[PDB]
Amino acid sequence: GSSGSSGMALLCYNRGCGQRFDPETNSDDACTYHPGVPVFHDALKGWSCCKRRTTDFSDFLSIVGCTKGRHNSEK
């Protein structure tokens, strides 16, 4: 019975996501990325898309997307 293999998980190419996703399920509200750009002011790394701002280089790359859409299977 053990079985679990797929082949429709497209890799997202949206800043902030870079995660996989399903096309047959993908929706305008299933992908959370940042339509803006990475900014660094006062040691506060963020994006010109949202108001989110963090000083931890780690958090910056974690900042969940502020926008919603369909995962980009293309760069």
Instruction: Dig out the tokens for 29 from the structure.
Output: 């509200």
Residue where the block lists tokens 């910056």: 60
Q: Would the annotation count 12 as a binding residue?
A: yes
Q: Is 66 annotated as a binding residue?
A: yes
Minimum distance of Zn ion from residue 48's CB (angstroms): 8
The alpha helices in 1-75, defined as continuous H runs, are 57-60
Q: What's the min distance (Å) between Cβ of 1 and Zn ion?
A: 32
The partner residues of 31 in beta bridges, in order of sequence, read 69
Asked if 34 contacts 50 with a C-beta cutoff of 8 angstroms, the reply is yes
| Stretch 46-75 residues interacting with Zn ion (CB under 5 A) | 47, 49-50, 66, 71
Q: Which residues here bind Zn ion, judged by CB under 5 A?
A: 12, 14, 17, 31, 34, 47, 49-50, 66, 71
